[PDB]
């Protein structure tokens, strides 16, 4: 009835997709080979998981996902792993050479070789839908494929579909921790090119999740798997309203309607609570008010920034499980009372509420404790202007010397595109400065 297509671009996208699809199969009881042990009805019915899983053959559920990568390493990890029989063999699309953390490669040189194949696969998936709401694109800014090919695919999908919601789950470049030396270039170019072709891009940060795993989960040494599982919990909290009925449902279009005040400001920060280990779970009364208050703690934000340095323009609180709406009402009123949580004057109604019935599902061998309820906050705040200014300063420092510029110019990039992207980023910084002014 209502379908959603997930697109996983780059290594980060594919790994987060592995985590998300493990969590989906756990929540819906789908075996790793697509079979269902309680498969009483075959060939129809509801079975609300038709949003992400399509019924094929006789008693097999195939994810509505396209995995895209330019090198075969990660997709081959997928092709020979636990869920090799889950995905359609043609949904796992690979090139032959990586983008080498080069936006120019993944956008012009290499992305042009498989963009048509990816779009044809996406078209084949979309033709099997009757109520396709939108797409979910998982990627990272500071990467190669996940930046250049992500922007190219966003442009092509904006051309082909147009009015379908285009949501992104992006790994924002951390302010201190980093992987690539040329992350500012790729991040600025991606932001410039995919800005007007995206509806809502959810921001997460590896450094903030590191800090959350250290402080809250009591994990001194987490790997990328723990980060991927937490991001998967966030994704499941976002899509649970589609996959499960609740007291107050929120489809995907309501996110872009409620969280995006202006067409150029669509970067809401992800936040999840409660995130606690199993040891301290027995010593806390995880009430609605406690989790609602923990959602606004500066130490619990999934992006390394300080919300107290800015104002909230739009906030979305998605509750799950044993949640009473009166308690949500009271907790949000208490939040509005606090003077340390500043909202813009031009948004007197600042919250959007969603309440589901399905409690969070514990992944076997996971980190998070079994809780009765959880809240995922998607807040659009002006505090991300500081992160954008930091990225702009790094970009300026690297570009004033023309460092690494030849690596992009020799791949089909015209040098003026750097200047154009930088001017647009300055304009975006001015946008964020202007919306934060009370008048």
């Amino acid at each position: 009835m209502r379908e959603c297509i997930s697109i996983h671009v780059g290594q980060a996208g594919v790994q987060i997709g592995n985590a998300c699809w493990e969590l989906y199969c756990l929540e819906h009881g789908i075996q790793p080979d697509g079979q269902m042990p309680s498969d009483k009805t075959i060939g129809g019915g509801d079975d609300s998981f038709n949003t992400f899983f399509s019924e094929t053959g006789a008693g097999k559920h195939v994810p509505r996902a396209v995995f895209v990568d330019l090198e075969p390493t990660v997709i081959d990890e997928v092709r020979t792993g636990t869920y090799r029989q889950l995905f359609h063999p043609e949904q796992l699309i690979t090139g032959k050479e990586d983008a080498a953390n080069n936006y120019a490669r993944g956008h012009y040189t290499i992305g042009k070789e498989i963009i048509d194949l990816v779009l044809d696969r996406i078209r084949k998936l979309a033709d099997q839908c009757t109520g396709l709401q939108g797409f979910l694109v998982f990627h990272s800014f500071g990467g190669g494929t996940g930046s250049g090919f992500t922007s190219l695919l966003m442009e092509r999908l904006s051309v082909d579909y147009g009015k379908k919601s285009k949501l992104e789950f992006s790994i924002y470049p951390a302010p201190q921790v980093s992987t690539a030396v040329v992350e500012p270039y790729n991040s600025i170019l991606t932001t410039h090119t995919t800005l007007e072709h995206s509806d809502c891009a959810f921001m997460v940060d590896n450094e903030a999740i590191y800090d959350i795993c250290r402080r809250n989960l009591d994990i001194e040494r987490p790997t990328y798997t723990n980060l991927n599982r937490l991001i998967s919990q966030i994704v499941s909290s976002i899509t649970a309203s589609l996959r499960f009925d609740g007291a107050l449902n929120v489809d995907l279009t309501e996110f872009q309607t409620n969280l995006v005040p202006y067409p150029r400001i669509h970067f809401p920060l992800a936040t999840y609570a409660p995130v606690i280990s199993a040891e301290k779970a027995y010593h806390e009364q995880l009430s609605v008010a406690e989790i609602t208050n923990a959602c606004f703690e500066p130490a619990n934000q999934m992006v390394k920034c300080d919300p107290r340095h800015g104002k909230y323009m739009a906030c979305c609180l998605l509750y799950r499980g044993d949640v009473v709406p009166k308690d949500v009402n009271a907790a949000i009123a208490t939040i509005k009372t606090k003077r340390s949580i500043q909202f813009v004057d031009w948004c007197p109604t600042g919250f959007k509420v969603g309440i589901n019935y399905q409690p969070p599902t514990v992944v076997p061998g996971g980190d998070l404790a079994k809780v009765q309820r959880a809240v995922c906050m998607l807040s659009n705040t002006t505090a991300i202007a500081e992160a954008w200014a930091r990225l702009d300063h790094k970009f300026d420092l690297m570009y004033a010397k023309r460092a690494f510029v030849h690596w992009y110019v020799g791949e089909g990039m015209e040098e003026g595109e750097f200047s154009e992207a930088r001017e647009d980023m300055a304009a975006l910084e001015k946008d964020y400065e202007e919306v934060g002014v009370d008048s």
């Binding site: 202006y262 067409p263 150029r264 400001i265 001017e423 300055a426 304009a427 975006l428 001015k430 946008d431 400065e433 202007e434 919306v435 008048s439």
Partner: peptide, 12 residues
């Protein structure tokens, strides 16, 4: 540089 969103176009 100038902003691009029209947040003040009809400030009346």
């Amino acid at each position: 540089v100038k902003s691009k969103i029209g947040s003040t176009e009809n400030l009346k």
